[PDB]
Amino acid sequence: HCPIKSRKGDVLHMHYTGKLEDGTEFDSSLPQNQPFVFSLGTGQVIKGWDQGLLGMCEGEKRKLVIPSELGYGERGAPPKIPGGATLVFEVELLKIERRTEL
Numbered sequence: 001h002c003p004i005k006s007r008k009g010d011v012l013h014m015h016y017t018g019k020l021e022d023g024t025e026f027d028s029s030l031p032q033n034q035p036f037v038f039s040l041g042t043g044q045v046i047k048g049w050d051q052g053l054l055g056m057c058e059g060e061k062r063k064l065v066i067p068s069e070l071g072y073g074e075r076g077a078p079p080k081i082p083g084g085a086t087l088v089f090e091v092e093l094l095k096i097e098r099r100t101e102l
């Protein structure tokens with residue numbers, strides 16, 4: 001059951017856990033139980049998120065495996081992310097907030 005699914009310009013509420021290749025976890029929203037909120041497809045987030053999160057239903061989970069060209073490239077994001085790194089995100093969509101009227 002999925003009456004609405006994510007499209008560009010939607011505001012998404014998401015839980016995530018990010019891991020590096022060696023399985024070590026570098027960030028997660030679950031411990032503080034505070035979902036991350038962003039607008040899809042506006043360039044607010046790394047490309048691998050904007051491209052990997054379309055057509056999603058609330059309640060759906062996805063595993064994203066993001067190569068560094070779609071992530072933080074050659075400079076990375078010190079201290080948690082080295083340059084050239086592949087990122088693994090496990091994500092869950094909690095809510096779609098979509099501007100309905102004009």
Ligand SMILES: C=CC[C@@H]1/C=C(\C)C[C@H](C)C[C@H](OC)[C@H]2O[C@@](O)(C(=O)C(=O)N3CCCC[C@H]3C(=O)O[C@H](/C(C)=C/[C@@H]3CC[C@@H](O)[C@H](OC)C3)[C@H](C)[C@@H](O)CC1=O)[C@H](C)C[C@@H]2OC
Nearest residue numbers: 016018026027028036044045046047049071072077080081
């Ligand atoms: C002034 C404070 C900064 C401001 C911080 C917040 C609102 C708090 C928010 C929870 C972020 C987290 O803070 C605990 C933390 O999330 C990470 O741990 C992480 O899991 C991650 O990779 N995420 C977060 C979840 C969405 C995907 C990705 C991201 O796209 O993040 C986005 C990101 C960094 C995009 C850059 C922007 C510049 C481009 O040039 C670059 O390159 C294209 C891509 C984040 C959300 C930015 O929009 C907003 C911010 O950065 C980063 C490893 C480090 C990051 O803190 C820095």
